[PDB]
């Protein structure tokens, strides 16, 4: 599915005393099967702009078209998967069957779940009959985030979208999450992502935007982002990696040879 | 449109002890697509000529011709959008459609404002979508200031008369301000704003008329107005652009350093 | 100009924690030369009412249909006049003209005022040369009031909108105010007022409408009013015009003979 | 604090096409203790007359004696507490507290102002605890009313003049405003109201004086004006009460059934 | 009256949905006598702070000392003369003399009016029988600031507080009302300015405060302020001033002549 | 612990344009050992009166007094047991021994959890060694029921304070949880509820207040209450407990033989 | 307070399917004023350990000795203030005074509350006057964190547990949460850190021990573990600092250019 986010602003609570701006003529598009960071510190507002792709928050001007076409929020829902952070803190269900089952049965209840569930459970990496009878909340940290995932794929969305997936992974966690990444886009899906941790994502993702108050400050590739972007809150790597890009090389290929200081 | 004053005089309040005569014969050609402002102190006619010359004031004694022609006030309103001082303080509408597209309604009650009240939203600076349904009451300063010019051009009057389109803006307010009048003049359009104070308005007109107590006392072009108006309540840059119009130069644009090193490398 | 208002809801900042409900689901109609008196107590919502009316505010649901259509608030404005209580404290001007001619230089700059004004000033009792250079200030209570009710009526809108005209008024201002809106009757045109005073306005007034708490809870007559409508808070005159009508008799013709408790 | 008013007029703007003469030759006393109440149209002058009583007008002419002695405006200020109409309007606080506590600090500045306030606050019916702390701007229309009267009656005046007290107010802003003036009286202190409509507060006075045109036309009890005063712009209550108020029975109180049962079975 | 701000920090509707942050851990003294400019862009806080010290406002955080001690609002009002731009605009009343008494019979009302009438119209330029009769209203532009300004000393306060007492004037007017802003310096008063119109009234100031997103940025002197300020928003002659200024001479003795450009 | 409310008025978000009246002028005395159902309808500000003794809000107005004392919040704390209803859905413990301990480990870190963990299971009726290690989720809904309530007892308040303890339970929980309630009052502690559950409760408690849009309207004995109190609302068997009350026997003792329709 | 681990071992839910040893056989001593971290993936056991050394949770086997004494956890509960992950979370007040306040209550029954709670506040950086009346659920996420923390040490316990405590938090967050960790050990007390990633917290720690599986397989200082531990998992900054500790140069603040010029000038 097409995205294309057409000069969006929104302004919570607009037209009474707490109307508070959050996004301001912002406009980009995301091609199918692109992974996408969108970044940005503190009062960006990207959440609120990866809502609005989600069709959760209808903006207050301008318009989301997917496929060419404006869609309310209702019309779109059942193409979009979005997770926020700790999602395995939401899990309700008694067995990992029914909290994977979740979407598909309330998205498409005229579709058998069980092959469904099947399929998003083996793609993430979770074999059917040693894990569909467990208790979601005794499980191991990487099998629930594991969960988790099954759970917002098993409608087979065209997009995808994490909010801030990584907070409170370990390094084995966010390895086997941007594993699972990889594999949508193997598949040909849309990932959108938000992720303080710029410098593990970049590695997995085409194109940065970044926002600053409300406003589209970059857009471009990841090549270009390191290239070109403010550097001043670049991680030490990341700002290896710019040098290596500015003019020369693809740092992304590369595995911690990397050091070419080489001059 | 072309307006010729001839000979206005001007009274209020005739024959009481509120009695003030306005303006005094004052005479003064605007030819189509004019950049003119017209200064003086508080008090010196400005704002009130202005009033006469778009057809709200009916003035005591003398004409104003419109194309050569007598007409009475709402002859001619039509052509001439005038913003008062704080025109946003005008607003009865709850979005900023409804404000600038009631101003459509009379002259075009069949049609469909929209795309009049789309060319002057963006006329103004004010992204169609973006602000068509702001609440207008919760706008910046400038961005209120900008509908309201909005809704005073809606219909495109030949002539737009500004009265001191800057007061109470900040920096970004009169950056915003003035970029609409550029644009008025773009078009060839006739532009006029009343300010007493000339510095922050003089590089974008044409020429300069001042009146004192009622009376015009100067009308001369920008570069006439810095050779041979009295200089004696000039700002400091002023007397700079002055000092260096004398035999000659160019002070407008130019640049702000630009100016002062060739000042006394005279 | 025929009014109806359909199933009208109004809730102040709709969507946000100070959302509060004004009306509930109101429906009525005016037809064209109908005075009618809106009443009720404190949040009833008669005001928001008569300034949805007005076209001041965009209803949250339902509509107001003119002449059997809908119509937005810019669309119908030129076709309303409205004044609030102690309009002289809005004065802006320095002559009579200029106070009176606002309303047709705003709304029809392409009109003559002039004649608009004369027949203005004339139809309050404003003698045109006596009182067009006058500061209206300096008027006398009686004069100013005219002056202010001649700048709603000078563009000869169809409806005449009055929100509480008689407060802060003498029994003389009441009884020259009430008959400006005799005539105005007398024209065909429509009025709507609401007044506290409902025992002085219902002498002037064909039906009566009561919100309470944002809702319709009468809508009839004056003779149907006093008759059925809850008479609580009935002044003694009211009661006795009451009884009266309780099958019976057209009090609003009568005067102070009245009393007939001759049984 | 006897008042008593002599041979007061009062002119303003003279000289002007604006003057006009508010008082003509008015003379008037007012006892420790009575309950008056003036009345006449708009502009007949009334609250001229009590401005000037107040001392917060020095009249053109004539004098009035306080305790039978003259006195500047100024000099008895402080024994009379006067309030205006939306009395309300002139909130400066944040609080009730801070509101009513201001009209301590002049009389009293180096005294704690909590008890005056306090008494004031429940003088007017505020629960103190309830109110202290309760921002101006949010509350009702009574509430408001009432505290604006607290910080007129705060430091303890003899005299308390309200003018048209009622006005804005619902049926229980209205029944807590009498209340206060019922208060006031049962205290033995002087407390004059100022409404051109007497029917409901001519029920909580003793006497009714009436202006017309800047001059005094009736001074009598409330008896005596139903009586005699110019019925002509009587309500149909008061035409009720003074049908009955001819050859004996007092209308006052009574009952509102109670009246008319009783009037021609004459 | 010293006047010491210790650690204020305001936020408007604190602990609401709507808490709107205005000032932040400010703190500055002025000495009695002293005439200082708060200055900054749009929000800095700085109308909230001459609020704050005139009383008007209850700082959520900090205090303002008076005298060294602390004070409610409520109790050095009295001290106070604050007024607004276009103070003209609230004139109440129909002649001069109660325009100008009415601060001395609120705050007074136990001391004779007219001899602080008198002299308050005197200190402004004002002559008592020629102006105490008047109609405000129709006075001239800079009759009426004179009335304006009389009736904010009238009761003799410590401290005059002016917010953007210039906005509307021209450059005769400014000179005026600078002009009486000087003599009250002379007795020894202090002065409290906020002025878009750094340029004008920087001749006139002893110290600049400078405001910033509800922080104090700047506190000096006007000579340290030219020379150690953020000289980006600065005039043409500011910069001149400045220059000078920097390492050197005192620009605000100096007429026009001013141009030492002499290298 | 006595409690008194001494004329306590509560409004939220006071002074902004989101305030919201809760309580106004409530006083009410709750003798230690005392059971006091408050009762009342949508928005009567009942929640809002427990949750002030509970030491949750600060109150607008008024008091709260403790032993004769005014105290803050956290000062009466640890003396304060309150649940609201579904308790068992804010379980975060995996054994239940976790889950009971909490509020003394929090309270009281330096008094030993273990004694006062089995006082509290034992009082509900939970065997310390057959649930100490059960995972509360699993428990029977009447078991985790128990563990709820052991949960906010663990402490030894004394008050217990239960906003709705009823709702969802069937007529097993109810008298469970009632039983409990019955022996904290055996105790000689204080117990507070709401209860929309009027019928049954009545049975179990000593004294009613019934708030009405944040007034106290009723505050007496249960005799009191069926005898005087508004009895529109009354179920059929309240309304029979209130025949035979109105001056006669005490239903409360009786059982379903109540049908003394005898005449 | 010294600490030290005796051989200690803990199983949750023993016997039942979900069975889980969190800890085998560790033991660790830790000196008074030692600034450690513990380290190790979600699961190695690590917050478990630091929980049991609290005295939270009585251990499976083994003992925590405290001055070389066994304690029941209650007894040495307030020797120890433990951070858990978002301690914000547990918030019961509607102001950061009584929130911290109340952790004072217990310890402190009969005192002020008010000097350890502007000490607590202070110390975490939280200006006392500026946020005591601040309501925490309108605060920043740095501000509650520290809030959270002020609330656990607010009495003064000798040692300081932090689980994970920069998460979630932006960049000014971090500084502000380090600048307590500093503090607290220019002040000679223990400071103990749960963290996965060591990146960004070994330049403000001693030494760090590793947890894998319940078990403890690395205890050394930051020098040591860069020098010696597995390093398959280092970040690239990490195998850089380690790259020039191999043969001496010690990599602790030095900077952060000044660390790269410096590696392959080898």
């Known amino acids: 599915m ?15 005393p707490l109307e508070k701006k959050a996004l301001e003529n912002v406009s980009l598009v995301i091609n199918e099967g692109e992974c996408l960071l969108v970044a940005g510190n503190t009062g960006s507002g990207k959440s609120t702009l990866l809502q609005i792709v989600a069709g959760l928050i ?6 989301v078209l997917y496929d060419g076409e404006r869609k309310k929020g209702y019309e779109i829902r059942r193409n979009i998967g979005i997770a926020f952070q700790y999602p395995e803190d939401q899990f309700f269900a008694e067995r990992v ?14 579709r058998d779940p069980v092959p469904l ?35 917002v794929i098993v409608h087979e969305p065209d997009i995808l979208i994490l909010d801030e997936p990584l907070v409170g992974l370990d390094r084995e966690g966010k390895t086997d999450l941007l594993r699972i990444v990889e594999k949508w886009k193997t598949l040909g899906k849309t990932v959108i992502l938000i992720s303080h941790d710029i410098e593990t994502v970049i590695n997995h993702v085409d194109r940065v935007v970044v ?20 550097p001043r809150f670049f991680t030490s790597k990341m700002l290896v ?12 290929s590369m595995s911690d040879d990397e050091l070419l200081e080489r001059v």
């Not at 097409?2 to 009474?16: A, K």
């Not at 209808?58 to 318009?63: A, F, R, V």
């Not at 069957?97 to 598909?104: L, M, P």
């Not at 990696?241 to 992304?252: A, I």
């Open 58 to 63: 209808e903006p207050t001007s301008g318009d």
């Open 241 to 252: 990696m710019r040098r290596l890009v500015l003019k020369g090389e693809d740092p992304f």
């Open 97 to 110: 069957f029914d909290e994977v089952a979740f979407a598909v049965k309330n998205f498409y209840p005229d």
């Open 2 to 16: 097409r995205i294309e986010v057409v000069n969006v602003s929104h302004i919570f609570h607009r037209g009474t």
């Open 211 to 230: 926002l600053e108050k409300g406003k589209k400050v970059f857009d471009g590739t990841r090549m270009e982002f390191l290239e070109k972007y403010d």
């Open 117 to 151: 569930v099947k399929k998003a459970m083996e793609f993430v990496g979770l074999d059917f009959d040693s894990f569909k009878d467990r208790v979601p909340f005794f499980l191991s940290g990487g099998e629930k985030r594991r969960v988790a995932i099954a759970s």
